[PDB]
Amino acid sequence: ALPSSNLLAFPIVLQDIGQIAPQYRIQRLDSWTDSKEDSVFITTYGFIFQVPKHELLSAAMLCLGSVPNVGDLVELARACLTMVVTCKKSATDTERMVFSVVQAPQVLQSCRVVANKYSSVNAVKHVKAPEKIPGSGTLEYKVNFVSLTVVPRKDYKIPTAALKVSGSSLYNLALNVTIDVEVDPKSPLVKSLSKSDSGYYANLFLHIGLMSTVDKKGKKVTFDKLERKIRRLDLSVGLSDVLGPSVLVKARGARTRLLAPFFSSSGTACYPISNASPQVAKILWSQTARLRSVKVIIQAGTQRAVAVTADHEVTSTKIEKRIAKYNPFK
Amino acid sequence: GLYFDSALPSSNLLAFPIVLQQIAPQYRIQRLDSWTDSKEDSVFITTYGFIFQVGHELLSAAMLCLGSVPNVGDLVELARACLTMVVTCKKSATDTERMVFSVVQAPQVLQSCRVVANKYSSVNAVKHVKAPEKIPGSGTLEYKVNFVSLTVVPRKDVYKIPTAALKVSGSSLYNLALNVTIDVEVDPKSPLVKSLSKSDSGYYANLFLHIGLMSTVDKKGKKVTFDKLERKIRRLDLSVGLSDVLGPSVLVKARGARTRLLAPFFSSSGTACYPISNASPQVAKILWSQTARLRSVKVIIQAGTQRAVAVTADHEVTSTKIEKRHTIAKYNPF
Taking the alpha carbons of A199, A204, A208, A214 in that order, is the dihedral positive or negative?
positive
Query: Which of these, A111, A128, A133, lies nearest to A9 by C-alpha position?
Result: A128
Report helix, strand and coil shares of chain B as percent, to nearest 5. Answer: 20, 40, 40
| B97 contacts A277 by C-beta, under 8 angstroms | yes
Question: If you ran DSSP here, which 8-state letter would residue B318 be given?
Answer: E
Query: Which of these, A156, A152, A145, A180, lies nearest to A272 by C-alpha position?
Result: A156
> A11 touching B, CB under 8 A?
yes
Question: If you ran DSSP here, which 8-state letter would residue B20 be given?
Answer: -
- Spell out the residues 6+ positions from residue B225 whose beta carbon is closer than 8 angstroms to its own: none
| A148 contacts A29 by C-beta, under 8 angstroms | no
Size of interface A-B (CB pairs under 8 A): 213
A100 to B311: CB separation less than 8 angstroms, yes or no: yes
- Spell out the residues 6+ positions from residue A145 whose beta carbon is closer than 8 angstroms to its own: A5, A8, A22, A23, A24, A25, A44, A45, A46, A326
| A162 contacts A249 by C-beta, under 8 angstroms | no
**Which of A203, A207, A284, A299 to mutate to probe the B interface, most B CBs <10 Å?**
A203
SS3 A256: coil
Question: If you ran DSSP here, which 8-state letter would residue A29 be given?
Answer: S
| A141 contacts A50 by C-beta, under 8 angstroms | no
| B318 contacts B299 by C-beta, under 8 angstroms | yes
A247, with CB counted inside 10 A (0-12, 13-18, 19+), is buried
Query: Which of these, B27, B30, B36, B38, lies nearest to B78 by C-alpha position?
Result: B27
| A209 contacts A262 by C-beta, under 8 angstroms | yes
* Dist CA B231 CA A200 (whole Å): 57
User: A308 contacts in B (CB within 8 Å)?
Assistant: 102, 119-120
Q: Which candidate from A100, A133, A178 shows the least CB-CB separation from B310?
A: A100
How was it solved?
X-ray
Neighbours of B92 (CB within 10 A): 23
Strand partners, B211: none
Query: Which of these, B171, B118, B115, lies nearest to B145 by C-alpha position?
Result: B115
Tally of residues, chain A: 330
> B93 touching A, CB under 8 A?
yes
What secondary structure does DSSP assign to B177-215, as a single string?
Answer: EEEEEEEE---TTSGGGGGSEEPSSSEEEEEEEEEEEEE
Burial B149-174 (b: 16+ CB within 10 A, else e): bbbbbbeebbbebeeeebeebeeebb
Q: What are the structural domains, with CATH classification, of chain A?
A: 1-156+324-330 (2.70.20.50), 157-323 (2.70.20.60)
| A245 contacts A302 by C-beta, under 8 angstroms | no
Query: Which of these, A170, A154, A163, A261, lies nearest to A205 by C-alpha position?
Result: A163
The CA-CA-CA angle for residues A219, A225, A229, to 5°, reads 120
| B89 contacts A270 by C-beta, under 8 angstroms | no
* Dist CA A58 CA A50 (whole Å): 10
SS3 A46: strand
Q: Which candidate from A95, A283, A308 shows the least CB-CB separation from B208?
A: A95
Taking the alpha carbons of B161, B165, B167, B168 in that order, is the dihedral positive or negative?
negative
SS3 A51: coil
Euclidean distance between the first and final Cα of chain B, in Å? 17
Pairing type for strands B141-154 and B26-31 reads parallel
User: Does A53 sit behind a cis peptide bond, omega within 30 degrees of 0 on the bond before it?
Assistant: yes
User: B164 contacts in A (CB within 8 Å)?
Assistant: 93
Pairing type for strands B120-124 and B97-105 reads antiparallel
* Dist CA A215 CA B154 (whole Å): 51
Reduce the secondary structure of A261-324 to three states and give it as a string. HHCCCCCEEEEEHHHHCHHHHHHHHHCCEEEEEEEEEEEECCHHHHHHCCCEEEEECEECCCCC
A94 to B133: CB separation less than 8 angstroms, yes or no: no
Give how far B161 is from chain A: nearest CA, Å. Answer: 9
> A55 touching B, CB under 8 A?
no
Resolution limit in angstroms? 2.2
Strand partners, A49: A56, A140
Phi-psi region of B168 (alpha: psi -120 to 50; beta: other; left: phi over 0): beta
Euclidean distance between the first and final Cα of chain A, in Å? 23
A133 to B307: CB separation less than 8 angstroms, yes or no: no
B95 to A160: CB separation less than 8 angstroms, yes or no: yes
Strand partners, B274: B250
- Spell out the residues 6+ positions from residue B109 whose beta carbon is closer than 8 angstroms to its own: B69, B73, B77, B78, B81
> B209 touching A, CB under 8 A?
yes
For residue B18, what is the nearest residue in chain A, using CA coordinates?
A: A191
Query: Which of these, A212, A180, A187, lies nearest to A300 by C-alpha position?
Result: A212
B133 to A92: CB separation less than 8 angstroms, yes or no: no
What secondary structure does DSSP assign to A145-214, as a single string?
Answer: EEEEEEE-S---PPPTTGGG---TTEEEEEEEEEEEE---TTSGGGGGSEE-SS-EEEEEEEEEEEEESS
Put the strands of the sheet holding A235-241 in their side by side order: A268-272, A245-251, A235-241, A318-319
| A207 contacts B93 by C-beta, under 8 angstroms | yes
Put the strands of the sheet holding B271-275 in their side by side order: B271-275, B249-254, B238-243, B321-322
How many alpha carbons lie under 13 Å from residue B186 in its C-beta half-sphere? 31
Query: Which of these, A1, A131, A143, lies nearest to A60 by C-alpha position?
Result: A143
User: Does A36 sit behind a cis peptide bond, omega within 30 degrees of 0 on the bond before it?
Assistant: no
> B179 touching A, CB under 8 A?
yes
- Spell out the residues 6+ positions from residue B36 whose beta carbon is closer than 8 angstroms to its own: none
A135 to B207: CB separation less than 8 angstroms, yes or no: yes
* Dist CA B157 CA B41 (whole Å): 10
> B99 touching A, CB under 8 A?
no
| A25 contacts A146 by C-beta, under 8 angstroms | yes
